[PDB]
């Protein structure tokens, strides 16, 4: 038996992030979805371009390892630096934490957007099983399964048949 994303993920889904597991008369299958997988990769790659910048600002020595500077100014420098170190440590931590929270929610949102897309193309010919699948109330051969995936499935073709089987 077979389950969707509401239960868990698919350790078997190798060539994509998001996908389809179908069960029919011919058997059981898993194909990846390209556009929803790519959209989530691009979004993440966009963060990396932002955060893998190298600073253009140049900084020179103010200080000296070999011959220590006068105490007072050295202490001011050491203090100024530490306050700055505090700031960047805070910023760095918050940024990663904020971005990670968003990276998660971003990807959940992409799963969400695919499932509610399918539900809409399947129209009145299927029901939500609650694990992230649709019980299709008609016969759906490997072709009909492939027409859902590649968003060509026309629901009116199977409507009268399916409608009747839900009653």
């Amino acid at each position: 038996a077979i389950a969707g994303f509401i239960e868990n993920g698919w350790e078997g889904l190798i060539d994509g992030w998001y996908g389809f597991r179908h069960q029919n008369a011919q058997g059981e299958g898993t194909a990846a979805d390209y556009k929803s997988t790519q959209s989530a990769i691009d979004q993440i790659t966009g963060k990396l371009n932002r955060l893998i910048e190298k600073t253009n600002q140049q900084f020179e020595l103010i200080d000296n390892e070999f011959t220590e500077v006068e105490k007072q100014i050295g202490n001011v420098i050491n203090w100024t630096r530490d306050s700055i170190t505090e700031v960047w440590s805070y910023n760095a931590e918050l940024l990663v934490a904020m971005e990670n929270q968003h990276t998660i929610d971003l990807a959940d949102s992409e799963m969400d957007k695919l499932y509610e897309r399918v539900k809409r193309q399947l129209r009145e010919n299927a029901e939500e099983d609650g694990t992230g699948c649709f019980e299709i109330f008609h016969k759906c051969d490997d072709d009909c399964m492939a027409s859902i995936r590649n968003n060509t499935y026309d629901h009116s073709k199977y409507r009268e048949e399916a409608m009747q089987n839900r009653i």
Binding site: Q23, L51, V69, A92, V96, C133
Partner: protein, 316 residues
């Protein structure tokens, strides 16, 4: 009946990351944000590089023996070393670290003679501390003695215009003799003034002679002073003894970066963020290697590691 499930991938070994809300939530994939990896060499490719070694940086202006290679050195990257010394005859610069800071971003130095000449005094002052072929001195400097032992020292004035477009680094020195017996043997009796005026700068100097701790056989000391002489300005040196006179003014060439280090150069690897332990090649926005690192660098942070998630939640 026939069903179609919607799913997302997962794995056995999720990487743990932090979020606004949860410590250590697993994700499919994550990259490091804090650089820890350092190359234990100065990556100098693409850059003229002067490894001062034995030679103190301030020494390139005054020219003790250690620094003869470098009296007119030219560079993009300047490396000072712990063994480096700015002197032969004991002494220090006043305002040393400012001057260092200047020379490090100076591109190097080009020397010019200031054209002083001298009557009724000696010029060949020397010491076994600055030795080349035996007793010698600071290359760019002249130790003005009195004409013979105990002899009087003619009160003199000497001047130099800076006819160039850029400012001229001017340096001179005061001699602090190990006793009053020495001060007189060299520049004679009487008390001794040395007065230096540009226009934008005035200041004065009295030699303090006296017993001090013996440093390289020497009990006396040279105070080294300096100034930036302005285009078209003149510096004038009025003095009656105890004066270590400049032979040559220095001019800055261009732009450079100086660093302090304890590892080899390497002209093969390219780099841009250096520290004492080596060079930090990395694109990561942060680093945890060294807060005093310099160049174009990742921001230094307190933390070993901050993993940034590059994948969705793991639910296996």
């Amino acid at each position: 009946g026939d069903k179609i499930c919607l799913g997302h991938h997962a794995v056995s070994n999720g990487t743990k990351v932090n979020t606004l809300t949860e410590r250590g939530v697993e994700v499919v994939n994550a990259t490091e944000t804090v650089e820890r990896t350092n190359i234990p060499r100065i990556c100098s490719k693409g850059k003229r590089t002067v490894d001062l070694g034995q030679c103190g940086l301030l020494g390139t202006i005054t020219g003790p023996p250690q620094c003869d290679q470098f009296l007119e050195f030219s560079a993009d990257l300047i490396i000072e070393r712990r063994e480096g010394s700015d002197v032969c005859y004991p002494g220090k610069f006043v305002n040393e670290e400012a001057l260092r800071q200047i020379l490090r971003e100076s591109g190097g130095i080009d020397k010019e003679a200031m054209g002083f000449t001298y009557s009724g005094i000696r010029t060949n002052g020397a010491t076994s501390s600055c030795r080349r072929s035996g007793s010698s001195f600071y290359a760019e400097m002249k130790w003005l003695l009195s004409n013979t032992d105990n002899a009087a020292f003619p009160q003199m004035t000497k001047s130099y215009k800076n006819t160039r477009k850029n400012p001229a680094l001017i340096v001179w020195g005061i001699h602090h003799s190990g006793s009053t017996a020495e001060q007189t043997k060299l520049y004679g009796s009487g008390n001794k003034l040395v007065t230096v005026g540009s226009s934008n700068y005035q200041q004065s100097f009295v030699p303090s002679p006296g017993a001090r701790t013996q440093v390289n056989g020497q009990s006396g000391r040279i105070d080294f002073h300096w100034l930036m002489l302005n285009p078209n300005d003149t510096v004038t040196f009025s003095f009656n003894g105890a004066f270590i006179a400049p032979d040559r003014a220095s001019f800055l060439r261009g732009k450079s970066m100086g660093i302090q280090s304890g590892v080899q150069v390497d002209a093969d690897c390219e780099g841009d963020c250096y520290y004492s332990g080596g060079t930090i090649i990395s694109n990561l926005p942060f680093q945890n290697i060294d807060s005093r690192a310099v160049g174009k660098c990742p921001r230094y942070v307190k933390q070993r590691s901050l993993l940034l998630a590059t994948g969705m939640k793991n639910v296996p």
